[PDB]
Design an enzyme around this catalytic site. Structure first.
Site, PDB file in Angstrom:
ATOM      1  N   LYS A   4       0.784  -1.229   0.000  1.00 46.89           N
ATOM      2  CA  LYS A   4       0.000   0.000   0.000  1.00 46.89           C
ATOM      3  C   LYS A   4       0.821   1.287   0.000  1.00 46.89           C
ATOM      4  O   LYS A   4       2.001   1.300   0.384  1.00 46.89           O
ATOM      5  CB  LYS A   4      -1.038  -0.014   1.123  1.00 46.89           C
ATOM      6  CG  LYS A   4      -2.251  -0.843   0.748  1.00 46.89           C
ATOM      7  CD  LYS A   4      -3.288  -0.863   1.834  1.00 46.89           C
ATOM      8  CE  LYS A   4      -4.618  -1.337   1.283  1.00 46.89           C
ATOM      9  NZ  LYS A   4      -5.138  -0.391   0.256  1.00 46.89           N
ATOM     10  N   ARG A  25      -4.010 -10.273   4.349  1.00 48.80           N
ATOM     11  CA  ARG A  25      -4.380 -10.290   2.932  1.00 48.80           C
ATOM     12  C   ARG A  25      -3.206  -9.739   2.126  1.00 48.80           C
ATOM     13  O   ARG A  25      -2.897  -8.551   2.207  1.00 48.80           O
ATOM     14  CB  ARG A  25      -5.638  -9.436   2.718  1.00 48.80           C
ATOM     15  CG  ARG A  25      -6.116  -9.353   1.249  1.00 48.80           C
ATOM     16  CD  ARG A  25      -7.363  -8.476   1.114  1.00 48.80           C
ATOM     17  NE  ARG A  25      -7.808  -8.387  -0.277  1.00 48.80           N
ATOM     18  CZ  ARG A  25      -7.368  -7.481  -1.140  1.00 48.80           C
ATOM     19  NH1 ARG A  25      -6.469  -6.574  -0.754  1.00 48.80           N
ATOM     20  NH2 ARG A  25      -7.824  -7.481  -2.386  1.00 48.80           N
TER      21      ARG A  25
END
Ligand SMILES: OCCCc1nc2ccc(C(F)(F)F)cc2[nH]1
Ligand SMILES: OCCCc1nc2ccc(C(F)(F)F)cc2[nH]1
Ligand SMILES: OCCCc1nc2ccc(C(F)(F)F)cc2[nH]1
Lengths: 274, 274
Positions: B220, B254
């Site tokens: 991210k 995840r």
């Protein structure tokens, strides 16, 4: 504001508050035909120290033949021929503090004279207590690692803390100042794989002693035991140990894979607010 | 003994106590000339799901065009043509539970009918509350992610917990059982880089709600913000987030890089005693 002093290393100063300090591991690659000082052997060390510097190392840890991982039986006389030329060349060409990874007082002395800034003792001043006299005299930081000549523990963490205190007492009796003491839990030394995991799990207990803590887990056997992976496939495993160590408050990590562990440490530092 | 139930996923059952569960990310690679179902597009998904299975994934998360990272505007009608063939082929050829990454109730319904086992909702049942009716009816687990259409927080962690509770209430009012609720802090959604770090630092607070927590931080932007590294150079950064997440009690991670993160998670699990 955890530490109200910086680690003074001669011309270098290490801040203990702003980031996790990365100590890059440099093991000698002995030339087969000489006792030390040869171009190929020393050039290898210099090139490696420069790479680790470029990859984020704050300290270069230099180890001769008698230290980990090899533990060769070698005289201090032989050991000096090998270690001193490395320290001379690395200290001249690489602008970082150098630690000497030795448990031998005379090696430590000559290493400091050759330009080393920190003593890193895997026996925590217990194998050769005069190493603490050397540390005190030169007013250099000394890393006292937990270690034993046995794995017969009554209670692992309580015993480790007691053993580390015995090392602290030796150092202070010799005149080592509190600001020059660093502790290391000795993961991978005198412990079963299970005990190594337990020490990792409880690493934060070392903080009650009030000294900075260095964690050295890089590529160690216990990681292979968990993951069933050989020494060259332990980046991820080493990484987990580094991250957990930082979360539990360690000030230094001693690692082979400087590029990768420096990135992981920087990310950890940002998240924990260091 | 943290969890007194297992996550029931149809023919699959996930134990929440024994290891951190790895959810592998599978994003559709749309064929330019079709709406879905074509060989190259579906074969790519199947091959990728098999690789992630072989690398240690416990769940395969399947996302069409309208979800992260692309957020394309696409009708449910178009979205179904694309997502359903992937779920059909992956569920047949890969023996793992499948999660459908959608916030749309009709997509979720058709996905479950096509063979999906878990609903993964980035809007936590707030964008389309009927998704909770779908979850309840099929008695499947649903992951409710923290998210907002604004970053105006009064107090980040307190607001996140309140927002997550609003999601829990929607789910329970629709008939979703407690054992089918999973929460996600939504790192990288509706938060400044600084807020993302603060949420990581305080992740353990989510545990008071009493539901399993899934952490999704892989590659991210906030990792790039800290390290100044592009998306392909974030393994180390993702790794630190995974390790800290596990230390703070998360049950799932995840991730894109299943091989590497599975190893890191296994090492973390061993050290924390999971
Ligand atoms: O249980 C605590 C052991 C302390 C200890 N003193 C030592 C002296 C010499 C050596 C040796 F020289 F390396 F063999 C190893 C040692 N270990
Ligand atoms: O501050 C909380 C926001 C809750 C929220 N409800 C939504 C409905 C639709 C969409 C959209 F359809 F994706 F645009 C985004 C939304 N976000
Ligand atoms: O830079 C080395 C070559 C590419 C690379 N392989 C890695 C394996 C694990 C990790 C880890 F997950 F961060 F530990 C980072 C890595 N980076």
């Amino acid at each position: 504001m955890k530490w109200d002093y910086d680690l003074r290393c001669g011309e270098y100063t290490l801040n203990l508050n702003e980031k996790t300090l990365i100590m890059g591991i440099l093991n000698v690659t002995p030339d087969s035909f000489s006792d030390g000082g040869s171009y190929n052997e020393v050039d290898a060390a210099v090139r490696h120290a420069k790479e680790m510097r470029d990859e984020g190392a704050h300290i270069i840890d230099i180890g001769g033949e008698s230290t980990r991982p090899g533990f060769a039986k070698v005289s201090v006389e032989e050991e000096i021929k090998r270690v001193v030329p490395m320290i001379q060349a690395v200290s001249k060409e690489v602008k970082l503090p150098i630690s000497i990874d030795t448990y031998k007082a005379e090696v430590a002395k000559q290493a400091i004279e050759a330009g080393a800034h920190i003593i890193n003792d895997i026996w925590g001043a217990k194998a050769e207590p005069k190493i603490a006299e050397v540390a005190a005299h030169y007013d250099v930081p000394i890393i006292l690692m937990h270690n034993r000549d046995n794995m017969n523990y009554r209670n692992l963490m309580a015993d480790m803390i007691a053993d580390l205190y015995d090392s602290i007492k030796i150092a202070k009796d010799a005149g080592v100042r509190d600001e020059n003491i660093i502790l290391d839990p000795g993961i991978g030394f005198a412990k079963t794989p299970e005990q190594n995991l337990e020490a990792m799990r409880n690493l934060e207990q070392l903080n009650v002693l009030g000294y900075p803590v260095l964690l050295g887990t890089s590529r160690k056997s216990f990681i292979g035991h968990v993951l069933d992976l050989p020494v060259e496939e332990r980046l991820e495993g080493t990484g987990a140990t580094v991250c957990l160590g930082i979360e539990k408050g360690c000030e230094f990590v001693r690692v082979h894979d400087v590029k990768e562990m420096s990135r992981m440490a920087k990310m950890m530092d940002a998240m924990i607010g260091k």
